[model samples]
Target: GEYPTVNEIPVGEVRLYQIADGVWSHIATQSFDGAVYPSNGLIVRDGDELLLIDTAWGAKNTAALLAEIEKQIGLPVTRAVSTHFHDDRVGGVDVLRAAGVATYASPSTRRLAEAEGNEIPTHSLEGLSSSGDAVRFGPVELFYPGAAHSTDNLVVYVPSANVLYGGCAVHELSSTSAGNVADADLAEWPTSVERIQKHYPEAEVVIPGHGLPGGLDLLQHTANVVKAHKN
Candidate 1:
């Protein structure tokens, strides 16, 4: 009962919260079953289509995310990307794949998923890298600030919108003053966060993979966390 309940994310939309101008969220259910309280991913509007970052868990998880998208933008998802190869984060891969949405992962991610399977959460993977590639979705350009969360984590920054989706790189809901012992590059995370900060110095808002979205202070806090971890 608990296991099944854990997979449920309440097939409905929340109040439709916003971080920056174009960035929005659908409070997720972290039920770990079919109850309530789930991890959240983001649904961003690029152009005519939507860009979904992090797939969450199972069908209901994906459905909840889509439900929020339907209520907000009322459009189909054009592209999808995974922050890492975690089950909770990438478990909804099939759902996106069925919709014909293009999915991307780091080369290491592709290998890990194929070799080790999808048992690992995106937060625990390693060897992922971020490139300076961006996508042109409609009038908005999506930015990837390399990796900080996982070796394969991907951070998205929208210049025109002044919104940055840091994926699992930094905490979104609260301030993180440390790194995970399971798998984290404390020394490298600072550089990665700083790298993203320089790229989006004017960004007023930042969204993490979990919890609530925040502002530029989140970036500063992430950098501070890394410094603390190194020290």
Candidate 2:
């Protein structure tokens, strides 16, 4: 209600709202063409800690993103997680890290971040960072759920809220063929999603790295998408 309307990306399938909360999510509007998938992320607030899921497209988006975080959450982010090495997800690492935030990426994601060095996205070495395991934030934990979307994707879990930040890994509600196939291990996707289900079987809410935020229905849909796209 007290949010500002920023850049709105009307992708084929949804209206991506860059809200005042310094967080963005694809809201499915019936008029939305529902053709192309819109990329998205979350700025999770739990007490004093803030966890960012993706870096976004580049500098402009990233800067505005952090601005939203500061304005909305009213606190500095303790950590950030790049779902994968893809620019769409990790491009803002340098932007966030410059704010004195630690970015946690998968080991391979960190290597890719170093190797790409801004070549792949809006990335810079200054704000670049990575992480694994649960960071205690009062009553929350940022749990990692291995690789699914790429060799470096991870999920952020909040035990108290029963929320699972399923990076591109679980799709949550929709599916996509977007991948750096050179590094994508498609054959392992189905099993990876299965593992997430097994790991967080009781989670009541699910937030994808992209697409609309949802719940268990999203988890089931994710599994179906992988199976349908299986080679």
Candidate 3:
């Protein structure tokens, strides 16, 4: 695989790969029930500060993920962005808070998770920035391009590195269909992806929420999958 093996835990594996200058892929997975769900997160480091894209499936694994980030970047994660309300996306939010790492998510995501009795985020995007707005966290910029995979999914872009963390709005190369549409916008998924493509045309490294990382092709592929499902 392109992403080199970084570490491993009981539930899943962690792979590391560099895209641009300061951008890194910390692709990991967690087993649930009898199936394994992959979660892809990015590590953006600027000097001594670090921003994590998403948390692992749960607290124990999230701790391992953070430890690996510290080992690799020599700095602790100062903040994190949860792309959606899914457990794979925000499962480790509480663990992150315990480590003093501030976790941010859209208000809708926080609400949905709380209503479903899931982990709650420490900060809301409304407190960080307005909807459809892009806010800079040091070297990273986060944009909520409406809803797609989940009602509150958001994409993260690092202008300095030309990398876009597409979250679950985008799919990996190996994805045959939209992975989980139980909480997805089948009618609006393609349009949401179009928003992402338009917003980050300069993204050289497009990291989906799961699977191997690819370029802009992955974005188009994801759109096609949604369209197929719609048809």
Q: How many collisions per candidate?
A: 21, 10, 0
Please name the candidate that would achieve the greatest TM-score relative to the true structure.
3
Alpha-carbon deviation at 192 in model 3, angstroms: 0.9
Better of 1 and 2 by lDDT: 1
- The segments of candidate 2 whose C-alpha lies over 4 angstroms from its true place after superposition are 1-37, 117-146, 172-182
For model 3 the TM-score comes to 0.91
For 97-176, candidate 3 gives per-residue lDDT tens digits of 99999888878888999998888888877733333667777688888776789878888899887888998898988777
What candidate 1 gets wrong by more than 4 Å, as runs, is: 1-15, 20-22, 31-38, 119-147, 176-181, 229-231
Error (Å) of candidate 2 at residue 111 is: 1.2
Clashing pairs in 3: none
Each candidate structure's TM-score, on Cα atoms with residue i matched to residue i, is 0.74, 0.70, 0.91
Candidate 2 Cα deviation (angstroms), residue 197: 0.6
Residue-by-residue lDDT tens digits, candidate 2, 67-103: 7556645677776666677766766667777777776
